[model samples]
Target chain A: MEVKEVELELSSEATFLSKTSIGEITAGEKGLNPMELLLVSIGSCSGVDVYHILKKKRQEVKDIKIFLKGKRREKHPKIYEEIEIKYVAVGKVEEKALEQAVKLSTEKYCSVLAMVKPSTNLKISWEVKWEE
Target chain B: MEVKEVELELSSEATFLSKTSIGEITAGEKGLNPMELLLVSIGSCSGVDVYHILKKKRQEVKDIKIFLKGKRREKHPKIYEEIEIKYVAVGKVEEKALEQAVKLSTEKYCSVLAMVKPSTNLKISWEVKWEE
Candidate 1:
């Protein structure tokens, strides 16, 4: 749900060191896989929006996660033809607020969504989970 | 870069486990950061195009790397406004072939580039290195 990071740049392609709940990651090959990195970006970009959005509403939060699925065409360049996303919220949160936040991010705020839109089919869905 | 992966799903979202040159990765925040993943996707998307293009040309590639630079808007959502990428290669390869490969990747293939194009200023450049 929360995140921390640092980065290093090289002559050609740059890299970053990210500290997260899972562990430390360096995003170059000896780092994250390409498509893995791609899907994560989509989820995280929305994650950032949802996190800030929910925080702005002064909603009590427990944690957050984004589920991403990208379907690549079965051919050379196997590019993504369609992408599916799910936003999960753990803790008390309003249904309406979550929807708006995700909407703003995917439709407007997130660059990856916009950039890849013309080429890839994009769909998103969300949920709110709390202690019952 | 080469890759291996498996994914799982939940009520709202989905996730994947990846094996890479670095190690094992899970696509959630417990795995890679959002922007980290985003940039990696941009780089890797192009990386795939170039890798395949170069291979098709019968060029010998010892190793390859992508250098990526993205400038973000210093505002809420801090989305990428402009992106700069450098494709680096190691081993004996023709300059023209590499150039064409990189060009093809950024302009033709790579869905990330297309998705983010209208929203972000995109710039892509490349380089090659051989044991001289």
Candidate 2:
């Protein structure tokens, strides 16, 4: 049984410290707000998976950019109602490989997306830009 | 109709950039991993809500620390199945105020917790330490 743990210590209203088994990060000092952090988590969680999957397929990948847009409800909780993530891949990558990578990440491996799946309308799309 | 947007760019396998309306943050340059980022998002999401709720209730809050422990299932797409968050207040704060603040955060105001609640068992608790 593998359990991942993390600790977050609030230093002040504008700052906090987060520690996990891998590493730690400090926020609120010219840092990402909570909403932004959430977006990043979702993006990177799947992004990393896709990246590795494509690499394993021997695709020539140069760079990857993820665009995330989410709509929140007007109610008190204001949770995300819908989230759209688009992956723009820059490299001599095959469309089939990109599609497989994204599909695997979103459907199989991304833990963050799995957690948010119950409450979010997740729309994922991808495109590949061939680089010479 | 309100929408929140963010962008993430991966410069390398170990480096990425996240940007939002408020600010931007770079990760993977000796930064938190994707899992850690998810934990921080959960922690700070509720931590900020609790802090503001206590402030609104006129609690004398000197500082706040949030401890987050999460256990993930040992399998592919190992999502967090259990999460425990403990708030330790450092100040002349009343227990009732702390309790109210925590309740409001977990039950009413926190969007992240709301999203994760459907998929995980969230246990929230708090205690106040009197300061001179």
Candidate 3:
């Protein structure tokens, strides 16, 4: 399981101090290719949820793809402005069920989703079977 | 087939204009979910590369785990201020080899690593042990 607390004694920025899922947090006990690590980490956390949730709900996911688009700032220490996820579920699955699965995963299941949510405008969209 | 460029004529903000690799070249959905989802994408991008590169070297990688740390700015558009990668590999593996492997991947092979490299000073290190 993933533990949500800082291992460091608090030099200040936990953000600065460090790091999560089949993923985890490595409190400068690790540190990247750092930006890519986080971006990819966030994507993995959310993408996994979509896959697991839909599969668990009996959605025949022959192929499912999630492309998370994030708008970053134009300056230094540029954070994200807004985030949007494109969920492309390729298989025989209920659209409504898939939708709910995303909801559950992001709102409740995924840690990344929660942390980043407060910092930006997050949204979700989909193209089931690439538009029929 | 992965195309590493934004179709929108790529943007500077999107170091990862290319995606779909957060898995299958990969789904989920909803709230407080957006930022988290986006953050993981970068991690997955390089995460996959290290594994693949190591395997390609004919190294016996029983298990490879990388912990990612991200410290975004305190301001809005909290993009990644910097990142860290904690790589742990189990099973008999060469130190110098794996070290170069990560370096090569982050500095060159990994797209996400390359994309974010200029943005942050990526710190990557690894450890190997024989569980056999």
Docking quality (DockQ) for each candidate:
0.25, 0.64, 0.05
Name the best candidate (by TM-score).
2
What TM-score does chain A reach in every model?
0.75, 0.89, 0.70
Over the stretch B1-132, how does candidate 2's per-residue lDDT look in tens digits? Answer: 488898888766736777778766665434457766777888887778877878888888788888888788888788888888899988879999999888988898888888889988988788988996
**What tens-digit string does per-residue lDDT give for candidate 1 at B1-132?**
222222322122223344333455555334445565666666655666676778899888766766666677766456677777767777788888989988777767765665666667777666778754
Model 3: DockQ score: 0.05
Candidates arranged by lDDT, highest first? 2, 1, 3
Error of 2 at A127 (Å): 0.4
**Candidate 3: segments with Cα more than 4 A from true spot:** A1-132, B1-32
lDDT of 1 at B48: 61
Comparison by DockQ, 2 against 3, better one: 2
lDDT for each residue of candidate 3 in A23-104, tens digit (9 for 90 to 100): 2232211232234334444655556566777778877766655565556565433445566677777778888878887787
Full candidate order by DockQ, most accurate first: 2, 1, 3
Q: How well is candidate 1 docked (DockQ)?
A: 0.25
- lDDT by residue (A1-132, candidate 1, tens digit) is 222222233223323343333455564434455666666556555666677788888776676666667777765456677778777777789988889888888877765565567667777888888753
Better of 1 and 3 by TM-score: 1
Error of 3 at B92 (Å): 1.1
